[PDB]
Amino acid sequence: ILINQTVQNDFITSLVDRIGLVVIRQVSLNNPLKKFKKGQIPLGRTIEEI
Amino acid sequence: MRITFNDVKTSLGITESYDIVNAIRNFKSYVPLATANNVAEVGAGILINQTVQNDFITSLVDRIGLVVIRQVSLNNPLKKFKKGQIPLGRTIEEIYTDITKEKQYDAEEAEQKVFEREMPNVKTLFHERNRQGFYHQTIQDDSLKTAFVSWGNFESFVSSIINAIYNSAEVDEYEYMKLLVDNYYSKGLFTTVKIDEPTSSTGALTEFVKKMRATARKLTLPQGSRDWNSMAVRTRSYMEDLHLIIDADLEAELDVDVLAKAFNMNRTDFLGNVTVIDGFASTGLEAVLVDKDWFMVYDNLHKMETVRNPRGLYWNYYYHVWQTLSVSRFANAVAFVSGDVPAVTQVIVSPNIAAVKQGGQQQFTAYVRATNAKDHKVVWSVEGGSTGTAITGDGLLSVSGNEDNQLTVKATVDIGTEDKPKLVVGEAVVSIRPN
């Protein structure tokens, strides 16, 4: 169910349902082209190739 | 509203000046650690540079102010409605076990049924209302530099920075209580008692006093009344636990005595059981008499945060208080109105929410809150829509087989005339389980 709703119980109609467990989904995404990366340039802007 | 250094000195376990700020805490080789009569040295050490100045002021304001305000808010006159932090898994559900008589001892009757249950616990939901706000204030660098001349200036500065927030919060608490009372009265869940303008003359005043005394005596009946409360569940109250919220004009017209003689208290122990507010701002509401456990307040959090403006050379500290307020649906609560209230206020169905099988039966009874002595007749309707699903005039409803829809029983009272644009109804939710 996308949204929880007040479920009327068969023994007491004055109470509601309670969450007994909370689970957090965690996934990690990568990039398969990272193997083609070169290094870093901390200083300067342009690169010259000869 | 006049908090001084004595209040903070009692709230904390320290005497006059302290070095706990630079004990919790490089910071060490900037300020002296002595608590002697010297103040110029500690002032210079604090004001040597902006990093130390900001760190000290942040620690002081945040920690000390938060602790002091939390400690002082828990001892205000209206602290008996204040609970601690909200418990985990409160489930927002209230369960009350209705009180009944005993069953006669009979072996022949007991031998047939021994596993049989008794009765549903008439569950209901809490009536909630949450609040969240902030006050905030500013402190200048000038009135921090001019605060280390003597040890009295420092404590005066601390008291000054606490007093504004404390008094504003204390004032707002009463307004929030009045708002909650107004909302509850507008919902129509009080039980009403008719009076006639107590401040109009002298006879009206004594008539109102006598009516209040009779109402309190009827509320505190040892055997139970069931006539009061938003749901007829037969609860009993206490002479020493009733609390009265009265209008400012009404209490000014009345005196401290005789009002307490109506109860069993004598002034000293009665002034702590009455709250005074200036006007109810709801039609003709005059004074509301509730049970002690009727109103409760929990606090979600209290927090204090500081930021610094360096261009303007100042600090801003914000105090955030979040808390929730709950009024119970089972405690006794009397409205004591003087207006044009209708003859019938509300009709209540005892079974409330019920569940039945596909071919079962159920008895529903209705209680009408009539402000007059005239008896009224109640008609029963089923709404829904099916074949064989009908309810008799005495409130017995039988469920026919092959039913899927969810149905609600309604009890209606008419107090109009040939043209009747006025209906008061009570709804009971009935669920069905396959057999």
Nearest CA in chain B to A19: B89
String of b and e for A20-39 (b: at least 16 CB within 10 Å)?
eeeeeeeeeeeeeeeeeeee
- Does B156 touch chain A if contact means CB atoms closer than 8 Å? no
- Does A14 touch chain B if contact means CB atoms closer than 8 Å? yes
- Does B353 touch chain A if contact means CB atoms closer than 8 Å? yes
Query: Residue A31: in which H helix or E strand, if any?
Result: none
In order, the DSSP letters of B100-168 are: --PPPP-HHHHHH-SS--------EE-EEEEEEEE--EEEESHHHHTT-SSHHHHHHHHHHHHHHHHHH
Strands ordered across the beta sheet of B407-413:
B354-357, B424-433, B407-413, B379-381
The count of other CB atoms within 10 Å of the CB of residue B362 is 17
Distance in angstroms (rounded) separating the CA atoms of residues B65 and B301: 14
- Does B272 touch chain A if contact means CB atoms closer than 8 Å? no
The approach used to solve this structure was: cryo-EM
β-strand partners of B139: B315
As a whole number of Å, the end-to-end CA separation of chain B is: 65
Mutate to test the interface with A, among B90, B119, B123 (most CBs of A within 10 A): B123
Contact A13 B352 (CB under 8 A): yes
> Kindly report the CA angle at B251 between B228 and B255, in degrees rounded to 5?
110
Distance in angstroms (rounded) separating the CA atoms of residues B143 and B165: 18
Count of residues for chain B? 435
Distance in angstroms (rounded) separating the CA atoms of residues B181 and B399: 40
User: Counting beta carbons within 10 angstroms of the beta carbon of residue B12, is it exposed (0 to 12), middle (13 to 18) or buried (19 or more)?
Assistant: middle
List the resolution, Å.
3.0
Residue type, B333: A
Give backbone dihedrals phi and psi of B215, rounded to 5 degrees, phi first.
Answer: -65, -40
As a whole number of Å, the end-to-end CA separation of chain A is: 63
| Among the partner residues B89, B94, B123, nearest to A13 by beta-carbon distance | B123
Distance in angstroms (rounded) separating the CA atoms of residues B118 and B18: 64
C-alpha separations of B156 from B17, B130, B139, B151, B153 in Å: 12, 35, 14, 9, 5
Distance in angstroms (rounded) separating the CA atoms of residues B303 and B67: 10
- Answer for the pair B124, B329: CB distance below 8 angstroms, yes or no: yes
